[PDB]
Design an enzyme around this catalytic site. Structure first.
Site, PDB file in Angstrom:
ATOM      1  N   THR D   1       0.855  -1.214   0.000  1.00 21.12           N
ATOM      2  CA  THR D   1       0.000   0.000   0.000  1.00 21.12           C
ATOM      3  C   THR D   1       0.874   1.241   0.000  1.00 21.12           C
ATOM      4  OG1 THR D   1      -0.867   1.295   1.923  1.00 21.12           O
ATOM      5  CG2 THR D   1      -0.533  -1.078   2.217  1.00 21.12           C
ATOM      6  N   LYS D  33      -8.608   3.913   0.343  1.00 18.14           N
ATOM      7  CA  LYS D  33      -7.648   4.282   1.369  1.00 18.14           C
ATOM      8  C   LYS D  33      -7.551   5.771   1.626  1.00 18.14           C
ATOM      9  CE  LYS D  33      -5.050   0.198   0.133  1.00 18.14           C
ATOM     10  NZ  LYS D  33      -3.681  -0.293  -0.158  1.00 18.14           N
ATOM     11  N   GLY D  45      -5.587   9.802   4.273  1.00 15.69           N
ATOM     12  CA  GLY D  45      -5.259   8.532   3.639  1.00 15.69           C
ATOM     13  C   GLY D  45      -4.674   7.674   4.741  1.00 15.69           C
ATOM     14  N   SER D 124       4.362   0.650   2.546  1.00 13.08           N
ATOM     15  CA  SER D 124       5.486  -0.062   1.975  1.00 13.08           C
ATOM     16  C   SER D 124       6.072   0.555   0.703  1.00 13.08           C
ATOM     17  CB  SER D 124       5.082  -1.488   1.709  1.00 13.08           C
ATOM     18  OG  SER D 124       4.021  -1.484   0.810  1.00 13.08           O
TER      19      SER D 124
END
EC number: 3.4.25.2
Lengths: 174, 174, 174, 174, 174, 174, 174, 174, 174, 174, 174
Positions: D1, D33, D45, D124
């Site tokens: 993500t 998100k 977010g 990530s």
């Protein structure tokens, strides 16, 4: 996987299932795990590489030709190189082999083991098969073949790594 | 990575994705994971290191001229060297190989597997492809290529290590 | 285990297998993993303790009684306590629930999730089912029930933790 | 993500992907998100659990009216309750929140960071987005949204846990 | 460390930083990581032993003399021994090499990889460089050299193992 | 330890061994692992700590009068308190409980399982007992007690943590 | 252990401590970690096993008569054998070596590093010495020996594995 | 991070860098780690959450309001709650605080520590700073501020988790 | 497994159990762990792999004809080959060997131990046997065989890896 | 440590050693591990904290005052709180207790255990003592005291955590 | 750290070093590890956190007035609260406390040990001090203080976590 060998009333057998597992999923469901050897005089089953087999069973065949059908000896000479020969060593597996004389297991360690009553049950499902086999063998007049079969099912029913595809190899003599 | 192989009426394919992953990042997206070998009469796909595959496949060819192109027999030899030999023993890879006689996996464990319907699915996305490939092959008149492709994409959707770049080699023997 | 839910042509379903596993052996083979709720209007499936169920499903029912049949909300109100109430917290599971309105997953994390096409596939066999369900749903005219079924089988074939005992709960509305 | 936030000329954004990963498989591809809070005057977010984010954002709104919408001051409090409180302390998530005054991260470690140019990239794929976002914001007259989007895609190409589904909430105060 | 190679308008380059790290501290800050080869016709960069370099780059030079400037081939023949020669094997590193023909990476695994657009970004800072490089290369008319530079800075700014000492090696041809 | 429960013709049993293992040594050989509860109308066996079992069985009795002796309904509640409650939640044990209506497992995971034929086998030697118990119950006219005992001994021969000391509580409702 | 090497005006030194640690106890306090090599024209210090160093240094001499005393060139060869050769490959040590032309590290990773100002600090106390050595060399007119010594003591104060026993070899070339 | 405090000639300082790290990448590069307290009489630096700060520094201020400027005591009274109050406990950090009276460190452990010469060096770069500070303080007439500065740089040069952004807070008194 | 050796008045014995364990299950119960060597003048027992022992014992014989049957001297040579030689080095086993001159252990660590009174107890149940063997040998007039046997059984009762199948070889030299 | 209790001819005893160990060294060598309770009628031994003792033994005394000398019950009532009371829970130990009535072990688990023949052997030296005690008790006319003694020595000889300092508490009754 | 307590002729001491280690570096060298309590009538030393020790000693004083200064009795209580209480239970420390009646250790395990001759040595260097302290107290007429000091230095030479800074509180009752 589950390999089961029994012996009753001049009848010896080896039965196995056909599940090959990789992680948590089935790769194949019909792996032949029980073949024949020494001019269809010697039966066997096994757990391991489909190639490791085709190498260990060939060698074993010659070991008999070098020891006149004397199962045991050839078996003794087999497990020998199997733990000595640099190459042959990396081979991992569990051979179950039986002739009219007797039946036994062979481990990469070079051991030649003769179980309590020629009853053999190797593989992750081994003990469940053993338990059911032992049960039947002590409380019923069923046949060596009927045993391995029923015992194998019991296993495949308990063992998450064992299915219900069979490959039985009998042998009569009396 | 996902290598998929379907086989329908004189049509056998091998499709692979093209992602190469390092840690959690994509290093390359167009990796060619499928290629032809032995005067184009043989197709192959591989999971793992490219150079390792190049090594293994080359030797595979070698073994084919040695056994008049008999896939299996020539392939079993490879299942050998691979685990016995010092150098090869180090190579890390999964081989998917097909010709007009049969399809089959080849691993460094001296193992040569030929799944249920010549259906092959290896690599981290392997099962997902198998799952889809199975459903399609049993509820549609679609072809090998059509299945392989459609299956590979499903894999690419589920598998975090498989992308949507494809390379397909087909073989028509009808 | 494997829970599969599908929705096509005014028909929604939830199908599950019946294997409960402990280590490497099967404890039970016929576990009912798909029930019915809210005066047989709301269907559900689940992965977890038989009690966690008979507690999370009872509650869910009351949450619907507090929100006139409106699925989603009771579902939202459900995952709500499930992540707050000191006790309810220790409960572990994965509820799949679906009414004529919609379908969705609930995790102890309190999440309410509506998957792409009301397609649900939870459990260790989840993805294999998804892969096969997706394949079928996109390349054939089969029915929601026929999907979940076929998909579930595909799963149980790949997943070592999924068997072939089923429990389906359909629903018609149009 | 990956969650990305660029800010240029009275235009501030927040873009996220929509992948949810379980182990090595994609569970959902269209996860939302990013969302609005506090009468649309605030965009956010988040990396992590949706239900957790919902909880945290809810409280954040709470703190806003509690501080006349002063981001930071209302945001620090959240950093407080988050590390201190028993329940919240359990929540696993990363917050990216912006308004016309500034952009800033909010972590469970009671940390409230505000990067070099309100440039935010968490998750990530966070850095990769940051990398591209930086390069663009310093060699092109592109807009916040244009950068965020372009950066997010680059992230999606590098990061194995980030896909190409987007959700962008923008804010114009010019 | 971070190695970045780009190619635009008859211009190819390789740029690198000079940080060598040991644990959590910097050992040296000006390590030359980008040299020249094959009579200053072939440029290269690398991550690894200062000696491993001086051995791999020499060999590579001869491999070209044995393959008439044909970068690729010599490169192919290089990665060959690199995974074969018992000694040469222990060598660990990541060579990035580029001539007027093309550019590519070489790993101890023996792989010869040609990235999407001759864009190369190896090393712990690799992806951040890639992201920023890709960004610039797609939204600006900047030069191959200006790219690597700017991209390298972006990296050293994100990567804790990358600094701001550069060593660029260009090459013109058209 | 192995707890086994077979059920045949108005005869239901529960047999356990009596070994208590500490590390690799036998601490006690005559542990009583089966007992009666609820005015002898209920028999039970348990794997694990005696004091823990005593506690759990005590509460179980409690739940029985609390539900007019309805096993399941009274048993599910126990599955409740067990996972929820602070203290009980600590107890490490597995319960096997039977009456004339049914046999069933009770675990700390709020799980209440009732195997295929009321056939219960828990404890490290659990499966092996199950295996033999299955084989016997399907190829002989033997009784519950006869099977339980014979199965338990087989278990005791296979399982390194199960001895041959027995305790059998039977129940006749015929 | 800490090996420090400073270099100022025709004066280059190498100072080491003398502690040998085993577990958490001091085995020896006066270990000689610095010595002369190659007709006294070369000084050296080493982190690690004494005998290993004796081995490596001896060979280093060998390489010097081989390359007319060219430090680097003769040293790179050593950076070779060390990782390529079977035996040496086993040796564990860090070499600090200086002459009038330059100072430099030598590790078993085929690495030959020559830090910023010929300043060398290796061993667990390495950085601390570097830190102090740096400060002094840039804010005082102190000499190599004075710095090396003062730096080494600072190291000895910070580093739990460095004591205050010294051995210094100086080289004057002015 | 790296916090350095020094005291010389009626001058005390606290200097810090501005790098915040997450994994192997920099999140922010200009974090203010040195503030001011008690009506700009008391200076401080810290390693930790931006909130933990704005909570531990606010409190500290009030503790001084409860102990007429007397640093030490409020400091003692501070570390007091910081190890008792259920909530305050979860707070993690390392406060460096110094007034005209003295300077000292406070850890969540409740410790109040006065280092050798009011010299403080906390954080991953702590020792390298100490080593350089100590060197300077003992071999030069430089000022407290000049020390902390130079020392801080030395740190950021060695420490991979320390950068070159500073924030100094001096104090004069004589 | 437990190998016990007691020695009283011209009577020296060696008793072993017969269990072979795999994981937590008994593979074989009648393993022969004791046998005669060198024209019956030497008895021996072994812990570990059968084939390994066969290998080691055979060589032991070899060494005896080499040293006119001098146990120790011929045994020390074996303590050699065992750790020096490539193949043997791999064998895993513990040797108990006795003749009329003395008893003694032999391990692959080039170790030849001869306990306090020629009393030997090796294998997982080793100590327990020693404990009992000691008590008996010092408070009763019982004989070697009587002790060995009685001791072995005690071991078999305590040790989860030792059963009650025995094999005893005695030697009378009186 | 090693606690041994025996009972023969109207005589019961509890004997213990005195070694307290910390890591690999002896802290104390004369720890009193066997006391006396209930107006010197009830004897006991223990393994654990000197305080845990002076708390679990004081309580036990009062439990007897609440159950007229009836050992067992007070013992049951003891282990009762020991597993419930929030505080008492953290207490760790192994009480061995014995009166003229009977003897038994109590574990923090709340268990009350009566070993085979009132024979008790707890602690790391427990089994060796049991083995020797059992031997003596079955092959000689020695006294309960003589047993525990001799047994204890045997233990301290084998057990690295047991010494030869004793503390015995007998009891006569007939 | 090492805390040592010797006692001779109405003279009892407690000596500690002053090193505080963080990882592999010395954080402080002059830590005061010994102090007086209870109107100077009691001396103590401690291994571990200063603030923790301060807390524990404070309570210890509390218990002293609470028991008319009876060390042991007041000390056992502390052993109580320490293991039981929520907060204290967290404190990590080792206590050495002496008065004119006796010396003794106090650990968080509710253990109150009083070594062979009031000779106390705790902390990583504990044994080494004990070793030297023993040797001195048995072959010289030296005094408590003389031994403690000499022993402490020996410890400081062996133990990598003990320095040569001392703090000695003595007590004369002669």
């Amino acid at each position: 996987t589950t390999i089961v060998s029994v012996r009753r009333n001049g009848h010896v057998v080896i039965a196995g299932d056909g599940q090959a597992t990789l992680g948590n999923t089935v790769m194949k469901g019909n792996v032949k795990k029980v073949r024949r050897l020494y001019n269809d005089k010697v039966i066997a089953g096994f757990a391991g590489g489909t190639a490791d087999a085709f190498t260990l069973f060939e060698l074993f065949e010659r070991k008999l030709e070098m020891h006149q059908g004397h199962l045991v000896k050839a078996a003794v000479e087999l497990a020998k190189d199997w733990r000595t020969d640099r190459m042959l060593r990396k081979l991992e597996a569990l051979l179950a082999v039986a002739d009219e004389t007797a039946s036994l297991i062979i481990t990469g360690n070079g051991d030649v083991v003769q179980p309590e009553n020629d009853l053999i049950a190797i593989g992750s499902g081994g003990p469940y098969a053993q338990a059911a086999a032992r049960a039947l063998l002590e409380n019923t007049e069923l046949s060596a073949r009927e045993i391995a079969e029923k015992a194998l099912d019991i296993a495949g029913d308990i063992c998450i790594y064992t299915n219900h595809f069979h490959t039985i190899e009998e042998l009569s003599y009396k």
